[PDB]
Design a protein around this motif. Sequence first.
Motif, PDB file in Angstrom:
ATOM      1  N   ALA A   1       0.925  -1.378  -0.041  1.00 48.32           N
ATOM      2  CA  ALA A   1       0.193  -0.013  -0.101  1.00 48.32           C
ATOM      3  C   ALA A   1       0.804   1.280   0.121  1.00 48.32           C
ATOM      4  CB  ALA A   1      -0.952  -0.121   1.462  1.00 48.32           C
ATOM      5  N   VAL A   2       0.344   2.323  -0.761  1.00 53.77           N
ATOM      6  CA  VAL A   2       1.225   3.469  -0.825  1.00 53.77           C
ATOM      7  C   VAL A   2       0.242   4.726  -0.048  1.00 53.77           C
ATOM      8  CG1 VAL A   2      -0.001   4.666  -2.755  1.00 53.77           C
ATOM      9  CG2 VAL A   2       2.486   4.948  -2.334  1.00 53.77           C
ATOM     10  N   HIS A   3       0.923   5.571   0.589  1.00 58.73           N
ATOM     11  CA  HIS A   3       0.205   6.857   1.253  1.00 58.73           C
ATOM     12  C   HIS A   3       1.199   8.097   0.852  1.00 58.73           C
ATOM     13  CE1 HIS A   3      -2.424   4.331   3.700  1.00 58.73           C
ATOM     14  NE2 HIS A   3      -1.554   3.573   3.802  1.00 58.73           N
ATOM     15  N   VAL A   4       0.476   9.188   0.782  1.00 60.67           N
ATOM     16  CA  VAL A   4       0.955  10.470   0.616  1.00 60.67           C
ATOM     17  C   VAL A   4       0.708  11.509   1.577  1.00 60.67           C
ATOM     18  CG1 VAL A   4       1.050  10.079  -1.974  1.00 60.67           C
ATOM     19  CG2 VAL A   4      -1.066  10.973  -0.897  1.00 60.67           C
ATOM     20  N   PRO A   5       1.916  11.731   2.271  1.00 66.01           N
ATOM     21  CA  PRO A   5       1.757  12.707   3.585  1.00 66.01           C
ATOM     22  C   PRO A   5       1.596  14.092   3.078  1.00 66.01           C
ATOM     23  CG  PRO A   5       4.112  12.165   3.014  1.00 66.01           C
ATOM     24  CD  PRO A   5       3.268  11.239   2.194  1.00 66.01           C
ATOM     25  N   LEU A   6       0.447  14.556   3.021  1.00 57.98           N
ATOM     26  CA  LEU A   6       0.171  15.872   2.325  1.00 57.98           C
ATOM     27  C   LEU A   6       0.440  17.230   2.991  1.00 57.98           C
ATOM     28  CD1 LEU A   6      -3.886  16.307   2.593  1.00 57.98           C
ATOM     29  CD2 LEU A   6      -2.609  14.727   3.919  1.00 57.98           C
ATOM     30  N   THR A   7       0.403  17.260   4.650  1.00 54.96           N
ATOM     31  CA  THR A   7       0.651  18.407   5.009  1.00 54.96           C
ATOM     32  C   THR A   7       2.152  18.606   5.252  1.00 54.96           C
ATOM     33  OG1 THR A   7       0.299  19.906   6.941  1.00 54.96           O
ATOM     34  CG2 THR A   7       0.657  17.744   7.407  1.00 54.96           C
ATOM     35  N   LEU A   8       2.691  19.908   5.306  1.00 54.29           N
ATOM     36  CA  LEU A   8       4.252  20.164   5.492  1.00 54.29           C
ATOM     37  C   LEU A   8       4.967  19.668   6.520  1.00 54.29           C
ATOM     38  CD1 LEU A   8       6.381  21.581   3.891  1.00 54.29           C
ATOM     39  CD2 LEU A   8       5.717  23.781   5.351  1.00 54.29           C
ATOM     40  N   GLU A   9       4.090  19.364   7.534  1.00 57.99           N
ATOM     41  CA  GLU A   9       4.645  18.820   8.871  1.00 57.99           C
ATOM     42  C   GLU A   9       5.071  17.238   8.474  1.00 57.99           C
ATOM     43  OE1 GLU A   9       1.821  20.274   8.632  1.00 57.99           O
ATOM     44  OE2 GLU A   9       2.027  21.758  10.123  1.00 57.99           O
ATOM     45  N   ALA A  10       4.255  16.658   7.906  1.00 54.89           N
ATOM     46  CA  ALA A  10       3.931  15.276   7.418  1.00 54.89           C
ATOM     47  C   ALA A  10       5.080  14.794   6.386  1.00 54.89           C
ATOM     48  CB  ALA A  10       2.942  14.777   7.072  1.00 54.89           C
ATOM     49  N   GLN A  11       5.327  15.642   5.393  1.00 57.33           N
ATOM     50  CA  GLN A  11       6.286  15.570   4.451  1.00 57.33           C
ATOM     51  C   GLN A  11       7.776  15.665   5.086  1.00 57.33           C
ATOM     52  OE1 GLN A  11       6.054  18.132   0.955  1.00 57.33           O
ATOM     53  NE2 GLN A  11       3.770  18.133   0.878  1.00 57.33           N
ATOM     54  N   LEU A  12       7.859  16.797   5.847  1.00 58.10           N
ATOM     55  CA  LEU A  12       9.255  16.764   6.470  1.00 58.10           C
ATOM     56  C   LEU A  12       9.562  15.799   7.652  1.00 58.10           C
ATOM     57  CD1 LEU A  12      11.914  18.044   6.928  1.00 58.10           C
ATOM     58  CD2 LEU A  12      10.710  20.325   7.755  1.00 58.10           C
ATOM     59  N   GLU A  13       8.406  15.182   7.981  1.00 59.60           N
ATOM     60  CA  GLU A  13       8.601  14.115   8.988  1.00 59.60           C
ATOM     61  C   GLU A  13       8.986  12.956   8.309  1.00 59.60           C
ATOM     62  OE1 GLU A  13       7.596  11.406  10.310  1.00 59.60           O
ATOM     63  OE2 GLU A  13       8.412  11.887  12.496  1.00 59.60           O
ATOM     64  N   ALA A  14       8.402  12.619   7.251  1.00 61.36           N
ATOM     65  CA  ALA A  14       8.495  11.626   6.730  1.00 61.36           C
ATOM     66  C   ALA A  14      10.216  11.551   6.076  1.00 61.36           C
ATOM     67  CB  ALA A  14       7.608  11.248   5.404  1.00 61.36           C
ATOM     68  N   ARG A  15      10.425  12.880   5.799  1.00 65.35           N
ATOM     69  CA  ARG A  15      11.770  12.856   5.217  1.00 65.35           C
ATOM     70  C   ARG A  15      12.723  12.883   6.146  1.00 65.35           C
ATOM     71  NH1 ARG A  15      14.529  14.189   0.864  1.00 65.35           N
ATOM     72  NH2 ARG A  15      12.556  14.150  -0.084  1.00 65.35           N
ATOM     73  N   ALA A  16      12.572  13.056   7.322  1.00 73.61           N
ATOM     74  CA  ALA A  16      13.483  13.148   8.528  1.00 73.61           C
ATOM     75  C   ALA A  16      13.461  11.848   9.296  1.00 73.61           C
ATOM     76  CB  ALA A  16      13.158  14.487   9.396  1.00 73.61           C
ATOM     77  N   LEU A  17      12.370  11.231   9.511  1.00 72.51           N
ATOM     78  CA  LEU A  17      12.231  10.173  10.304  1.00 72.51           C
ATOM     79  C   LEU A  17      12.264   8.651   9.744  1.00 72.51           C
ATOM     80  CD1 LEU A  17      12.444   9.989  13.542  1.00 72.51           C
ATOM     81  CD2 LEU A  17      11.835  12.181  12.369  1.00 72.51           C
TER      82      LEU A  17
END
Lengths: 90, 1337, 99
Positions: free
Chosen positions: B452-468
């Motif tokens: 399954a795929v998921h797209v983090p849409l808010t800015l916090e979530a994008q940066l969170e996925a990139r960082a964690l």
Amino acid sequence: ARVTVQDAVEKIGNRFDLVLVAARRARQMQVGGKDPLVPEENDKTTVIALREIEEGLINNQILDVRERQEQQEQEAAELQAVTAIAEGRR
Amino acid sequence: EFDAIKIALASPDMIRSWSFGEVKKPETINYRTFKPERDGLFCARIFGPVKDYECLCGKYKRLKHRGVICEKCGVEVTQTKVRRERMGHIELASPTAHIWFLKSLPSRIGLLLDMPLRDIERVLYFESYVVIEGGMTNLERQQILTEEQYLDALEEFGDEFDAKMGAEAIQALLKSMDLEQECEQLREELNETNSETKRKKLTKRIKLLEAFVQSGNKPEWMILTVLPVLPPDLRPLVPLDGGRFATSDLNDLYRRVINRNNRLKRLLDLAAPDIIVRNEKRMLQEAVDALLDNGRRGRAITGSNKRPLKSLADMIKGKQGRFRQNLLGKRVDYSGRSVITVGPYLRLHQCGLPKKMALELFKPFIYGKLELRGLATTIKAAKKMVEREEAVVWDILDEVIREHPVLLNRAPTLHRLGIQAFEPVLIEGKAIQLHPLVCAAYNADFDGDQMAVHVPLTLEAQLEARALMMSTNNILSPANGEPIIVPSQDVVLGLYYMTRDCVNAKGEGMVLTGPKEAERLYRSGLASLHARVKVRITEYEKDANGELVAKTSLKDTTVGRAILWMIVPKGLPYSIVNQALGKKAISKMLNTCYRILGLKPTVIFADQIMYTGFAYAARSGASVGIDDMVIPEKKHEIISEAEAEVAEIQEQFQSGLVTAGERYNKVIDIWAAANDRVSKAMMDNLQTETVINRDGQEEKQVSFNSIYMMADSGARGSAAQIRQLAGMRGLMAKPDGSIIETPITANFREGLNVLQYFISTHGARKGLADTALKTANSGYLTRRLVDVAQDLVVTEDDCGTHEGIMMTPVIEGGDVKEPLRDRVLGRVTAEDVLKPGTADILVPRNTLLHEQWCDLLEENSVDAVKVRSVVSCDTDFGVCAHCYGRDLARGHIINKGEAIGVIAAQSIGEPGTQLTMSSIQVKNKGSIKLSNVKSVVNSSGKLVITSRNTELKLIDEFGRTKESYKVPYGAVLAKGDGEQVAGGETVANWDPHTMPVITEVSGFVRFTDMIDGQTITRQTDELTGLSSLVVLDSAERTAGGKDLRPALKIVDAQGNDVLIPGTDMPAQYFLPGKAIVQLEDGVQISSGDTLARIPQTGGLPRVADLFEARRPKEPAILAEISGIVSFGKETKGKRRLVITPVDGSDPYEEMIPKWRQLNVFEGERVERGDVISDGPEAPHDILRLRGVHAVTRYIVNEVQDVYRLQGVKINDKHIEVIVRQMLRKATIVNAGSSDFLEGEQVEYSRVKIANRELEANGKVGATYSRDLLGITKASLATESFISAASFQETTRVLTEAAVAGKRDELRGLKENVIVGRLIPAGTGYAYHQDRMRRRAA
Amino acid sequence: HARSTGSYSLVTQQPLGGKAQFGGQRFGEMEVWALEAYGAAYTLQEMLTVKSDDVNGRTKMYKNIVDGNHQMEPGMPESFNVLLKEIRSLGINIELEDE
DNA sequence: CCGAGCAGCATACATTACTTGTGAGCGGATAAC
DNA sequence: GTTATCCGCTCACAATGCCACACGCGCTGCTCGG
Ligand SMILES: [Mg+2]
Ligand SMILES: [Zn+2]
Ligand SMILES: [Zn+2]
């Protein structure tokens, strides 16, 4: 060009505070966008914020003092304007 | 908007307040006109208008009338959404019980009334009577009545005697009861009576009453009078293609109940035939009970569909209840799934993504970008453009995701890595490419497994996925500090082929000016990929910290290794490549690269490894053919010889020369021996069959066969599978577990007869069924786990304590199964561990034991170190940073916020899918230590052991412990303490079925009631003729010898009792039953002589029962205190047994099952915590006797043995936090100045902070006993309830937390998840600390 | 198949389940435990409320993300209000504390 | 005179059905004063 | 005899996640109806 975040988490010794302050700065540079300090390479604001972080010129204190300076300038200008209007109404 | 949740009963006034009206008619919708029937289960007047902002009758139709109610039909014209909110009420024509508080053990009403539940049920359902107020007659206020007694008392008393029956009777009984009056009555009474069973029930009842009167609840509310009906929209009558509206069962139940109510009211109006209305109220009570819960009281099946109806509770509990179905895990609208291919070209952080899936997912981003460039002014124009996919939309999409991360997830997400973050790359088709390394991390094959795929849409979530959660962050398992990015296969094969050495290969014997030169020499087809040459190489180094020196050496190597050297990133020395470079070697290389160079060059290096490995694997063309697997030319001979052996053995058996069982054993033994012979022969013929020649005769070398190249490199399959393929398949197992005599003499390359295949099928189906059950069982286990530690978040940075555990390398008796290095790697020392030379602190008191300090400890060779575990941290409502220690999956200490509980539960539950479902021989040399040993020297210079806790240890030259065995009572010692012995020497052996009566003081022996016939039975040793005596105890014989007791008085050499050397208490050697005594009367005793001789799971369920800490079958009983043993009265329920203390009193004469073997003497002074009747030590008793460190050591050792048996490794921090959780409850001993009761069960945190606050003042605190509950029951008794609610019960916890008014402060992971706000764990930890430091002042 | 937006379940304002119903994937228990194992607080939060529920919140997220602003205005997932109304439909009284 | 809705019906009965594993409250036997 | 004690008896209460597909979803003789 972001592949890791180790430099960033070195400049801010916690990944949590790292992503928090970086998201704050990215929100600054995305809505009401302050110009990105580090020259971007046509990238998303997120990695731009991370790069500005790891270069060593963005952190919690810097963001807070910049916000306070903005508050000071804003209040000075608007108070000058309101005093001008106050003289204009008399 | 809030920071807490309150829950309690609802007064009838409250319920009528919620409602916007009263439903009266049962029918819902007219079908000839699809409209809500007026005053029905969907009536618009009571609940809301159907059409948005439109009257029902059709009069008002515009927003100009928002708020007014019509008059043709009388509906408030507002938003239809309100029908999702407004509730209704039903004025029940007669009171009725609430099925929860009646049938939820323990029944609330029962405890609230001191009435047995059976009578309460018999009076609720109208089949009894209950007298109230206890009038002039001799009838008690709680007494019940049946028909004849009721009517007879009615004849005898026409008034002052009110025997009411049914629900309203119980309502009056409740409302008449005075709460605080009976509360204080039972309070003053509890300090008066005995025993503690009555006191236990009564303290439970007074706890109930105090919790009740404390909250605002009132007992008469426990009997409903006005039933609130759910909003209509939440039970929607869903239509079909025509008019076949699917009646949701809630409407059915409500129609039934309201119909009973209407009929009952009509009957109440028509003169009320008494028995008729009686039965009708009973039926209505039944219907309401079914509506609140269809479970109890039979069923309420729908028409012609033989299945029960979903009641209200059925909409909350279970896997379909709102908790586990919509609240905890909710479906996401912004995602997609597909099947995953390989895509082995993308970099480690990238991941494939089909154009279709991306174009469907990022649609709003695409609309935004199009609006920006103005390529479509209106949103509908942009939708059309995406619908047509103009040549610009692809450029737009490629732009909008240039850095936007994405989340990939596997279906069973066992542990934390089950969800990772990548950067998508657009591809064709519909598959989802993903890097092979992370697919080895997902535990994801390519058998068609979907992702399954998921797209983090808010800015916090994008940066969170990139960082964690970006793949370039997760490279170590949170369970073990091992690297999760391991090149699994198809590259280890490649590199292994690239790093070997053919003795005579084209190009051997040249000199190369560098690696690039060798690469050019190879690609040009002039030199073999692996031939010995002399290559100049510039391996870099870091002499000082930061520098990079270069030492251009000329090393003998091979072309392949030289080519591979073009990938190591200016770090590692050449010795990391020069070897044969199998799989473990690759893991080692990657580990040392991550250790030296950091992270970023290491991920680049791993990606380069993957690329070159696939490249040269393809270039190698490794291929398995039928003629690759060889059969040793002795296998036929070996098998024929073993056949002759087994044939003559079987003939011997049928010739009557060996018992059938030992014959079976001999047969299986020779068969296993022949199997090992064939395996070794096959291996020695395959691995070296390559006998090539260089400039002459012949040379051997490790094989080049394709098989065993896929094995020696560890690429795929072990030698055990190889021998099972080429060599003999070996023995096989019966369905029960036994082993068939005749093994599978054949092998896979050859044929298999039908029987052999049948037995192999036995084994294979056993394995498959085991997997198919263990998957579900381990799922349930990990789910229970994550719901008992979901609270743990590291808040404090330093608790500031001194109590840890004494970590020491485990020794099962043989070799050290685990040294101290790994058990202490990365965990802060509790005490300043000093080297064996005292007065020199080796490590300060708060040092994080990173790897260099572990090296120092290994240097000084310390036995054990005290460490600051989690089970001893002092953090209120949490755990400090240090007490958790090294943040596994990273290097530094943990950061305040990481939810250690959930990652611990996951790390423990993930490997669950890999589980299942007389003499002493020293080995090494060194001193011989004997701890806790009371032994006596016999007449043969040995040392016979006379105590139970005697522990033998073999110490090596370094003074550290090496081996440890448990010498039992009555073992012989060939050597004493400080005796250097060599291995194999049997220092101690003993007959298992002899518990001797050896004496520690010699002399003579006299008898006290040692008489034959009655107490003892004399028999001759018919083999020889010695007059042996079978001395029976009081229990062994009949009752004719109950009071008669043997006593072997250890008398002087004249016949008088002397004392014991050291003390003034002689040895009155009493006897256990079945004592075969040989020494006749008056015969001399030598110190240490046998006065008598008397004889005597494993997988996932093991760890399950261990964590539940359930009392095992006949557990090993221990001694509560110390003192001398003394029996009592036989068959006192169980036989009596007391242990007189040294000075204190022994008020307990504990009862012990007389039938089960008792390991203790009568003249023994047993220290507490000693085996009384051997077996498993129940964890409850372990804790209650030896504190918390004993129980945590025991549990971690047991579960760690269970895991090491399967080869999996789990760092002990996780099981440590779990045990810290399952003993967070406490019980109170005294009462003290605190407001705490005696037997009240409270949380250790709360009672500890109460003691702290009381010690701040002068008053005394209350002593507490740490409890220990099974993970399930521990989670159920959680301070917060919503967590415990959602977890497993959600029908008792709701009732309890309601009747007590337990206002749930969220302050937890699962709670905030339910609510939907941030989590106290992640960045939400920063948010929550900001809040509780600002909002809560 | 994927799902940007579309229909929603009427009893609980969540996206439907199934390829035919054009629904989206299901974020399960173990998925949430993983997501909260990492410190992915904001990710888990947005995946809970604004992605699936808080109909006003999700319409706001839509209208705000088409306008190039990835900030969320979360709230109370209507599934939780449904749970509230179910419990409250029983004799139990459950409330949201004032502060 | 049968077609189209309805109200409360385990179809009236003997439906029914091996072990699932565990905890927990409960009622009849049991030791003691 | 009674009072507290204990042991077998019966009942409540849990059973991995997803995905997909399929199928079905009262009735019925009394009641409203011409
Ligand atoms: Mg698979
Ligand atoms: Zn109207
Ligand atoms: Zn601590």
